Write a protein that binds this ligand. Structure first.
Ligand code: A1BCT
Ligand code: A1BCT
Lengths: 131, 123
């Protein structure tokens, strides 16, 4: 009584939500950006995604997408300086909160994570290197 | 090795909520008309609303900003549901729990329905 308002956090929710966002990415629905990842004259690799989700993972993505002006349809964004396999895992991280690596690719991933200022991935890579 | 950063989705939602409140990257405007109350507009991200509700997901699955009209749900309810989608938290009280529950039912947001029922039964 007394017009008091109560708040309730639903603890399973953000994990289920990200799962749905990842599903939509993989079925290429609602996406508004296509990344064209050109590295060292390999053929360009394409990844579709949602700007709001990439921005939520990376201050670099957030600045890129919120700063200028385009046609507010599907934007094709040229990306250089990072291997597509690295960018693939950084996108997967933004949508899953998980990242996989091996001895042969941890430095690659760390380098990408530094470049996109994904601090939590940088720290996971560090953890991996030291063990 | 595989890592899961257990705090990440909470932090990400924080940022998406910030972008919603600053009206950045939004691709849907909900125009909500109820009874005699003033019309309200809510800008959001279709992918985030879809993440919260099978009804929003079906609704959206067009290019650019889409203006979508909704009738027969009070703007304050819709506002609570949007806030939930971006925070994982729902607010209610004695005099609006049925209204929030109705909204959650309509949008098939089962977690929120259950939280409303829990609240109602506690009274
Ligand atoms: C850990 C190694 C690994 O799993 N893979 C997957 C299959 O492709 C090769 C290899 C890999 C993974 C990543 Cl994330 C990056 C790279 C890579 N190779 C060369 N140059 C760069 N910049 N990255 C290989
Ligand atoms: C719990 C009651 C409450 O917190 N509020 C918030 C401030 O506005 C008044 C009141 C409220 C909240 C909600 Cl979610 C809905 C309504 C409402 N009033 C009339 N008709 C409808 N459909 N909803 C009031």
């Amino acid at each position: 009584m007394g017009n008091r308002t109560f708040s309730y956090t639903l603890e399973d929710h953000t994990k289920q939500a990200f799962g749905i966002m990842n599903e939509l990415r993989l079925s290429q629905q609602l996406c508004d950006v296509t990344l064209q990842v050109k590295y060292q004259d390999a053929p360009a690799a394409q990844f579709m995604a949602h700007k709001v989700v990439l921005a939520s993972s990376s201050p670099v993505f957030k600045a890129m997408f919120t700063n200028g002006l385009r046609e507010q349809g599907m934007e094709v964004v040229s990306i250089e300086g990072i291997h597509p396999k690295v960018m693939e895992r950084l996108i997967e991280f933004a949508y899953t909160a998980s990242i996989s690596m091996g001895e042969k690719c941890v430095l690659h991933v760390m380098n990408g994570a530094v470049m996109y200022q994904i601090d939590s991935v940088v720290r996971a890579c560090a953890d991996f290197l030291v063990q």
